[PDB]
């Protein structure tokens, strides 16, 4: 199926407290594989996926010096944006970028992209055509005009069609995992002709999962409570879904768990101890 290489960059000023903090984080198919964090005496690129130890010292040195140069560019940009928006030199501000390529299973580029934000709002984006920009406000129009006058789009297209695709192929080669959920139902009291049935999924990877409760062959959507899927902190994820049911009718409800690691969806009910 398709694959992607994306970098998520952050630059955050902290006036009067130090130099901006700069981070560059890389993802192959949405799994983090490298990170650079400027907050250090002699900051360096670090692997974040174990298979990255395959790259030799020259790789780490090159990526480190390039990140340091990127960091210094964003330090300038933070100052430039104060001028564009007529903002005080005293406040903290944040630039973020997501930049990368998505390729199909045939190795062709499906989409290259680069999106900037300033203080949490869209600022400028590269259009699908890889030739033009969409500015979000008047300040980003200044950037757009500058990048249009500088042949920036062609430089970026060369990166997205060339370097990005080529290294993505190398990383996929070097890095080529599911863990099925284990599920169970717990039982808890409610104002007390009612009981809460909570269906748990634990120990699964990747994070994508769907939990439903059924009564009389139909899914309960009204009043089903769900938590956002969350990290266990060991590389696996958790989720639960709960419903309030009448006391004594627990066996009329069924939890269904759907996940890519499973041969077929799980079906389960509350199992009162013997």
């Amino acid at each position: 199926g398709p694959h992607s290489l994306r970098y998520f960059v952050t630059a955050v000023s902290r006036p009067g407290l130090g130099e901006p903090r700069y981070m560059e984080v890389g993802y192959v198919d949405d799994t983090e594989f490298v990170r650079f964090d400027s907050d250090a005496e002699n900051p360096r690129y670090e692997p974040r996926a174990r298979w990255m130890e395959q790259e030799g010292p020259e790789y780490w040195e090159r990526e480190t010096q390039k990140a340091k140069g990127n960091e210094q560019s964003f330090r300038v940009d933070l100052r430039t944006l104060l001028g564009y928006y007529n903002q005080s030199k005293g406040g903290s501000h944040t630039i973020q970028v997501i930049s990368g390529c998505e390729v199909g299973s045939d190795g062709r580029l499906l989409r290259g992209y680069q999106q900037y934000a300033y203080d949490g709002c869209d600022y400028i984006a590269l259009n699908e055509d890889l030739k033009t920009w969409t500015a979000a406000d008047m300040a980003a129009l200044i950037t757009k005009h500058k990048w249009e006058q500088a042949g920036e789009a062609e430089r970026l297209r060369a990166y997205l069609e060339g370097t990005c695709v080529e290294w993505l192929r190398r990383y996929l080669k070097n890095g080529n995992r599911t863990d099925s959920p284990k599920a169970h139902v717990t039982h808890h009291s409610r104002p007390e002709d009612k009981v809460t049935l909570r269906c748990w999924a634990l120990g699964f990877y990747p994070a994508d999962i769907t939990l439903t409760w059924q009564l009389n062959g139909e899914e309960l959507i009204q009043d089903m409570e769900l938590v956002e899927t969350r990290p266990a902190g060991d590389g696996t994820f958790q989720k639960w879904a709960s419903v309030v049911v009448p006391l004594g009718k627990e066996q009329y409800y069924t939890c269904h768990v759907y996940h890519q690691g499973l041969p077929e969806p799980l079906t389960l009910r509350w199992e009162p101890p013997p």
Binding site: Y7, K66, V76, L81, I95, Y123, T143
Partner: peptide
């Protein structure tokens, strides 16, 4: 490999 960014 991350690109070299251009100043805004």
């Amino acid at each position: 490999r991350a690109q070299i960014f251009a100043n805004i």
